[PDB]
Structures are given as structure tokens and as C-alpha cells.
Design a protein around this nucleic acid. Structure first.
Ligand SMILES: [K+]
Ligand SMILES: [K+]
Ligand SMILES: [K+]
Ligand SMILES: [K+]
Ligand SMILES: [K+]
Ligand SMILES: [Mg+2]
Ligand SMILES: [Mg+2]
Ligand SMILES: [Mg+2]
Ligand SMILES: [Mg+2]
Ligand SMILES: [Mg+2]
Ligand SMILES: [Mg+2]
Ligand SMILES: [Mg+2]
Ligand SMILES: [Mg+2]
Ligand SMILES: [Mg+2]
Ligand SMILES: [Mg+2]
Ligand SMILES: [Mg+2]
Ligand SMILES: [Mg+2]
Ligand SMILES: [Mg+2]
Length: 95
RNA sequence: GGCCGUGUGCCUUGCGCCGGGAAACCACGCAAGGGAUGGUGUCAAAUUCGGCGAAACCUAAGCGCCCGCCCGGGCGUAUGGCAACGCCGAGCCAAGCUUCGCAGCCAUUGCACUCCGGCUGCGAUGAAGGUGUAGAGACUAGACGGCACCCACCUAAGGCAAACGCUAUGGUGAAGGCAUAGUCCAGGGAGUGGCGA
């Protein structure tokens, strides 16, 4: 249902057809009114397909995205949203 | 269609040998013979532009030489030819591969930060191999070629085995297709004309 506070959020169960260059722009404008966004990682590989990571500036921007856009029908499919249990390599360089 | 020689290519044997390889066996340098060279299926495309190199054989202008000189001849001799054929640069190519773009189905609910599941469908791509390279040339199929597999034989590194050892993803089963089987038309047989010496 929910994991533990983190800047990055683990998203799965999505439409597995939209291209990498297209899906990055499909998440930019919709998930912007929560705060500053860092980077979005998308992979079409068998392990990572239908899965995406989204990183915000602060926890407040990440928690707002967790509640306001919870279970949004993204391309005819609702999305499962959890916090990333493992910290990203981007955040560790800043801390 | 058959004999007698010539050169070049080819394999076998016998011998050289800073080479690659674990070995088998490739690669080379040469010398002496023609006995020996698996199968089955599959692919039929690009076939273009230039350049380098060549023996046997054909020939003798220039040279030397001799007919005492000249006049004419005679001799040798490629730097002239033809050509088996050895390659090279660029473009291009059918399947089987190496890697990407898009579609389609079968899967998969998956926490990753460098990147990665299958199968058929074109399009693009690397590594072989081919074309270029036949008597001018043209078309047809095949194999002696490309690809996949099978068989025989050798070997045994890696893997397996406590171990005698076992096994190929390693090799070997010639070159021809610089036109091979064929059809076709060039060329000689069979004219005339140019160039050359
Ligand atoms: K002969
Ligand atoms: K050796
Ligand atoms: K050839
Ligand atoms: K062994
Ligand atoms: K020929
Ligand atoms: Mg024989
Ligand atoms: Mg044809
Ligand atoms: Mg004279
Ligand atoms: Mg005279
Ligand atoms: Mg002679
Ligand atoms: Mg000559
Ligand atoms: Mg040529
Ligand atoms: Mg031709
Ligand atoms: Mg042998
Ligand atoms: Mg040929
Ligand atoms: Mg020939
Ligand atoms: Mg022929
Ligand atoms: Mg004539």
C-alpha cells in the first residue's frame, strides 16, 4: 500500500507501449504542480518495463504527488505508487 | 574426340622452416609422381567503376654479332605481343550469422540506476564470402561455390570422471566456375581496310 519516505517514487502497472522519448514528456507536465522535479528514468527492458522512477526536490513535493495523483488512469491504466525503498545514485552525490 | 611435350595452379609423398595452435592440423620454401578427394538439403542475388602484376608460347623494330665495308641477307635477344591466371581501391549483393528501427503474438506485476526474454514480417547494420575477373558479350540452371546438417577419420584444450578414460564449440574429405554444365552470339575456318617494324 505505502512504503517509507523518499524523494524517488516507484511506479508500476502502466501502458507498456509508449516510447522512452515520449513517456518522459508524458510525465513532465502532469507531475509538475507539486514542486521542482529532478530526473525521470524509464527503461523498456523486461525487468523494468511498465515501471518508472520520479524524483522531486523535497519530501513535501513527493508526498503531494503520492496523494493528489494517487491511482491516476495513465493511458487507460491506473498506476500503483510507492516510495523508492532504495535511494538513487543522484541523491547520494548531493548528500 | 585421341596421343607427345610446355608453363602455371592442385593434392599425396619425401625434406627444409624466426610462424599461428593445447593438440590434431593450418601457413610458408622447395624438390618427385597423379593412385586417392563422402553425403543430404538449402540460397540464385549484386552482377558496377577504375588500377596493379604475370609464365609458357608468338614475334623481332632497337642493340650486339658475323657474311671483310656497302648493298642486301644470317644469328641471338624482349623493352613488342597474346594470355593461363595472381591480386588491389571504391561501389553493390541471395539466403545463415553480429548488431539496431518499426509491427504482431506468446509470456512478465517486475526497486533500478552502463547496458540486455523469446519467435516469425520488412527496413538499416558489422564480420566472412562474392561481384569486379568469359572467347566481345547475353540468358538458363545448377556445384567445385555460400549456408545448414549428417557421416568417416584425427586430435583432446574446455567441461565430466577418484580413476583406464569420455566428448568437438578444433581440424581433415584437392584445385577447376578469370564463364563450369547448357543455350546464345562474338572470333578462326572464310572478305576487305587501318596501325605496327
Ligand atoms: K598432358
Ligand atoms: K612450430
Ligand atoms: K574469380
Ligand atoms: K581434457
Ligand atoms: K580463361
Ligand atoms: Mg588422380
Ligand atoms: Mg538469374
Ligand atoms: Mg641489324
Ligand atoms: Mg647494312
Ligand atoms: Mg625463343
Ligand atoms: Mg614478355
Ligand atoms: Mg577491372
Ligand atoms: Mg562479366
Ligand atoms: Mg593433409
Ligand atoms: Mg566468377
Ligand atoms: Mg579457366
Ligand atoms: Mg562454359
Ligand atoms: Mg579476320
Amino acid at each position: 500500500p505505502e512504503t517509507r519516505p523518499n524523494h524517488t517514487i516507484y511506479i508500476n502497472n502502466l501502458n507498456e507501449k509508449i516510447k522512452k522519448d515520449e513517456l518522459k514528456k508524458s510525465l513532465h507536465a502532469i507531475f509538475s504542480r507539486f514542486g521542482q522535479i529532478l530526473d525521470i528514468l524509464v527503461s523498456r527492458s523486461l525487468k523494468m518495463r511498465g515501471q518508472a522512477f520520479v524524483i522531486f526536490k523535497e519530501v513535501s513535493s513527493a508526498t503531494n504527488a503520492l496523494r493528489s495523483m494517487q491511482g491516476f488512469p495513465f493511458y487507460d491504466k491506473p498506476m500503483r505508487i510507492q516510495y523508492a525503498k532504495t535511494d538513487s545514485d543522484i541523491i547520494a552525490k548531493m548528500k
